[PDB]
Amino acid sequence: TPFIRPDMKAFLEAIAAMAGPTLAEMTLEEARASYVALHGMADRPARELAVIRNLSCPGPAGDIPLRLYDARESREAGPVITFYHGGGFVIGDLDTHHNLCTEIAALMDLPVVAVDYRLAPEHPFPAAIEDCEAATRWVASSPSELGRTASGVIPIGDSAGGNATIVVSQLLGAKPADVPVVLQVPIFPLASDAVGSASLEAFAEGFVLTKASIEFFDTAYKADRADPRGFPILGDHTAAPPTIVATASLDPIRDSGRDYAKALVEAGRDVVYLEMEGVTHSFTNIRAAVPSTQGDLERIIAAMKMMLG
Numbered sequence: 001t002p003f004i005r006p007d008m009k010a011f012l013e014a015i016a017a018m019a020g021p022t023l024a025e026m027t028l029e030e031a032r033a034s035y036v037a038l039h040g041m042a043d044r045p046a047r048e049l050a051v052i053r054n055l056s057c058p059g060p061a062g063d064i065p066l067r068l069y070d071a072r073e074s075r076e077a078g079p080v081i082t083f084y085h086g087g088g089f090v091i092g093d094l095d096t097h098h099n100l101c102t103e104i105a106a107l108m109d110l111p112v113v114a115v116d117y118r119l120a121p122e123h124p125f126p127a128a129i130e131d132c133e134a135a136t137r138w139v140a141s142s143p144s145e146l147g148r149t150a151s152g153v154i155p156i157g158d159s160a161g162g163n164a165t166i167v168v169s170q171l172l173g174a175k176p177a178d179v180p181v182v183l184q185v186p187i188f189p190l191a192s193d194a195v196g197s198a199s200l201e202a203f204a205e206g207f208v209l210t211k212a213s214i215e216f217f218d219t220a221y222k223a224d225r226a227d228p229r230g231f232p233i234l235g236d237h238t239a240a241p242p243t244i245v246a247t248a249s250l251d252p253i254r255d256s257g258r259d260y261a262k263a264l265v266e267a268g269r270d271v272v273y274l275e276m277e278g279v280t281h282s283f284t285n286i287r288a289a290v291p292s293t294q295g296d297l298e299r300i301i302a303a304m305k306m307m308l309g
């Protein structure tokens with residue numbers, strides 16, 4: 001009997017009533033479409049912003065599509081948020097996380113660049129990482145197409161995108177971009193392997209992200225368990241940038257986030273650890289269906305402003 005907020009519980013009960021096919025039982029196109037539909041019905045609508053523009057940058061496999069969000073038509077030099085969507089490196093796109101990006105841009109009053117990175121199984125590991133790194137370096141170079149100057153970058157993302165957040169910060173730590181990572185925000189990230197964790201067993205079914213979906217994503221992406229680009233708990237934490245780790249108490253991969261924040265403390269790094277109580281994985285994108293999750297996102301926003309000082 002873990003604690004569940006009443007509005008969270010109602011949402012889980014509706015998912016249980018729906019009782020759909022698993023991701024593995026659907027076609028890939030169907031699995032991706034179902035995620036579009038979930039966030040479409042569950043998340044708050046997009047904020048209005050002065051700037052919402054599609055861009056691209058060069059990557060190792062070809063052009064990488066991007067989307068720029070800014071509440072301001074004109075802005076001086078400052079940090080730029082570089083966002084990587086969740087979806088297991090298999091599903092999601094610029095639209096599944098669009099509304100959340102408009103919210104981050106509105107509430108932070110900073111520009112946000114979302115990355116449409118290549119997906120598995122068509123593009124296995126490390127394709128997503130290659131694209132997130134390349135796009136982040138590109139933003140960090142203050143290209144003219146961006147129309148903003150970056151004094152620093154702020155990698156952020158949910159779930160797989162939280163994995164990408166940490167990996168990108170490690171890659172740029174080892175080989176700097178034109179400006180530093182001034183803050184990273186991995187939100188319910190995969191950092192250590194969740195297999196064998198107590199959270200994975202406790203929350204394997206009925207908490208939005210299932211063990212079955214985790215296995216489906218793992219089989220498609222094919223990350224090597226010994227590769228720090230796949231499991232960034234294995235990386236060097238001694239110069240990690242300022243970090244905010246946000247987890248959910250009902251998340252099967254909660255303990256992976258716990259592990260990462262513990263490793264940052266162990267290495268003497270500054271970190272805010274926030275474990276949202278009574279909500280699940282994906283809480284950043286269900287803010288209409290579960291209204292209390294808007295408050296959880298606002299807590300991350302407040303921690304970001306504090307850590308940016």
Ligand SMILES: CCCCCC(=O)Oc1ccc([N+](=O)[O-])cc1
Pocket residue numbers: 035038086087088089158159160161163190208209210213214217253281282
């Ligand atoms: C349709 C159920 C939600 C699954 C998609 C999602 O919520 O984003 C995730 C991305 C990556 C991982 N993972 O690394 O296991 C888990 C979840």
Ligand SMILES: CCCCCC(=O)O
Pocket residue numbers: 002198199202
């Ligand atoms: C192991 C899953 C239940 C949560 C107990 C804890 O907070 O560590």
Ligand SMILES: CCCCCC(=O)O
Pocket residue numbers: 262
């Ligand atoms: C149950 C595990 C206790 C803490 C392990 C550590 O300090 O890395």
